[PDB]
C-alpha cells in the first residue's frame, strides 16, 4: 500500500512550431557533472535541442531540419566523439537515413544509408560509443561503427525477424542485445561471442584505401535466443533490467520476464531454449496505440512510460517485488496528447515526456 517513492511536479511545458507529432526524446547522459542538462527532441522533419535550467527554464539551444526530403524523424540517440569529446546526436526515421549531428559545429557529421525502410530505434553500445544499433522496418537490426563508417553486423536473416524490428536494448554491461519486433518475437542477439569481438576489431581496423575488397559485415542469421509466447501481440519496446527483460505490447501492460526457467542463467542459455518464465507485469491503462517506448533512469532505480490519454506512470524498481505497488501517475489538465516517449536525466531528477501534439513536458522530482 506504499505510495511509491518519487513525486514529480510539472514545472514547464513547451510546444514545437511544426505542430506535427514528436516521437523521441533523449537526455545527454554523457554530459559531465554540473554541465547543463541538454536533451534532444525528434519530430516531423525537425530535430530540436534544448537545455534545462532551474524553475523549468527550458532554453531552445539549437534546431535542425531536413526540408530537402520528406524525412519524419522517429528516434534520437546521444553519443560523443571520444577524439574530441564533442557530444553527438544520432537521428533516423521514415527515410531510413542515419544522421550523426554534431551540435558543437551544428552540422551533420556523418550519414549512413543501408536500411531498406524506416528506422524505429537507435541505441548506442554502453561500453563503445562508436557502435550504433539501428532497428528498422526492413526486418533487420544493423550495427554501425560510426568511428570508421562501417557496417559491423546485420542481425537479420533466416532465423531473424519476420516483421519490423520496433525497438532494441543493450545489456547493462553491453553484452547481449534484445530486439522487440512487430512479428511478436523478442530475439536475443549476443554481442558476447568471439565472432562479435572479431567483427568489432576488424571494423575498427578497416581502412577503405588499404584494400579494394569491402568490409565483410557479419550476417548473424541465428539469434542466441528467441520467443513468441510472451506477448499475444507485437512488442513495441524492450529494455534490459540487468539480467531480466522488460517488454511492452498492446495488452496495456509491461511484463518482466526472463529467458529459460527460473533457475536458468542468462549467459548459460542454449539457443534452442524454448522455455520462458515471466516474473511480473506492470499494469497501466489506455496505452493501446503502438510505438510508445518507455524509459528507465541510468541507475535503473525507476522506469516511466507514457500514455495515449496523457497520463504518465513511473514505477519504483528498488521496492521488493516491483510487480506490486501502485506507481506514481503524473497528470496535467493541459496534457491531453499521447506521450510518444519519455527520458530521465543522468541523475533521475528531471523526467521529460514528449507528447503527440509536439508539446514537450518537463517534470522535476519533489524529493
Amino acid at each position: 500500500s506504499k505510495k511509491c517513492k518519487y513525486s514529480f511536479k510539472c514545472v514547464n511545458s513547451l510546444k514545437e512550431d511544426h505542430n506535427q507529432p514528436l516521437f523521441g526524446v533523449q537526455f545527454n547522459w554523457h554530459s559531465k557533472e554540473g554541465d547543463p542538462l541538454v536533451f534532444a527532441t525528434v519530430g516531423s522533419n525537425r530535430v530540436t535541442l534544448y537545455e534545462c535550467h532551474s524553475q523549468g527554464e527550458i532554453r531552445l539551444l539549437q534546431s535542425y531540419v531536413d526540408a530537402d526530403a520528406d524525412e519524419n524523424f522517429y528516434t534520437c540517440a546521444w553519443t560523443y566523439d571520444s577524439n574530441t569529446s564533442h557530444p553527438l546526436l544520432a537521428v533516423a526515421g521514415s527515410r531510413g537515413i542515419i544522421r550523426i549531428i554534431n551540435p558543437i559545429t551544428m552540422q551533420c557529421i556523418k550519414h549512413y544509408v543501408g536500411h531498406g525502410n524506416a528506422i524505429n530505434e537507435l541505441k548506442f553500445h554502453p561500453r563503445d560509443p562508436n557502435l550504433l544499433l539501428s532497428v528498422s522496418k526492413d526486418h533487420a537490426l544493423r550495427l554501425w561503427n560510426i568511428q570508421t563508417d562501417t557496417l559491423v553486423a546485420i542481425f537479420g536473416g533466416v532465423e531473424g525477424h519476420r516483421d519490423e524490428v520496433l525497438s532494441a536494448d543493450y545489456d547493462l554491461l553491453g553484452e547481449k542485445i534484445m530486439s522487440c519486433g512487430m512479428d511478436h518475437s523478442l530475439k536475443l542477439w549476443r554481442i558476447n561471442s568471439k565472432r562479435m569481438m572479431n567483427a568489432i576489431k576488424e571494423s575498427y581496423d578497416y581502412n577503405p584505401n588499404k584494400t579494394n575488397r569491402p568490409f565483410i559485415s557479419q550476417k548473424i542469421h541465428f539469434p542466441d535466443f528467441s520467443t513468441r509466447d510472451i506477448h499475444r501481440n507485437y512488442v513495441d519496446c524492450v529494455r534490459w533490467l540487468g539480467d531480466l527483460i522488460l517488454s511492452k505490447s498492446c495488452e496495456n501492460a509491461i511484463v518482466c520476464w526472463k529467458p529459460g526457467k527460473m533457475e536458468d542463467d542468462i549467459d548459460k542459455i542454449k539457443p534452442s531454449e524454448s522455455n520462458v518464465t515471466i516474473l511480473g507485469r506492470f499494469d497501466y491503462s489506455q496505452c493501446d496505440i503502438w510505438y510508445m517506448r518507455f524509459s528507465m533512469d541510468f541507475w535503473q532505480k525507476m522506469l516511466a512510460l507514457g500514455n495515449q490519454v496523457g497520463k504518465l506512470y513511473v514505477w519504483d524498481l528498488e521496492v521488493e517485488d516491483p510487480h506490486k505497488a501502485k506507481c506514481t501517475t503524473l497528470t496535467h489538465h493541459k496534457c491531453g496528447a499521447a506521450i510518444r516517449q519519455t527520458s530521465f536525466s543522468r541523475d533521475s531528477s528531471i523526467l521529460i515526456a514528449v507528447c503527440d501534439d509536439a508539446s514537450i513536458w518537463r517534470w522535476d522530482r519533489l524529493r
Partner: protein
C-alpha cells in the same frame, strides 16, 4: 491437499521471484557502479 499444494507452489514462486529480483538488483548495482566509474 490440492489447496495446500497450490499454496506451497505459490509461496515457493513468490520466494523465487523475490530472490531473483534481489540478485538482479545486486548485478544492476555492480554494473551501474562500474559504468558510472
Amino acid at each position: 491437499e490440492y489447496m495446500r499444494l497450490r499454496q506451497l507452489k505459490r509461496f515457493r514462486r513468490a520466494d523465487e521471484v523475490k530472490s531473483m529480483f534481489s540478485s538482479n538488483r545486486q548485478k544492476i548495482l555492480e554494473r551501474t557502479e562500474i559504468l558510472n566509474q
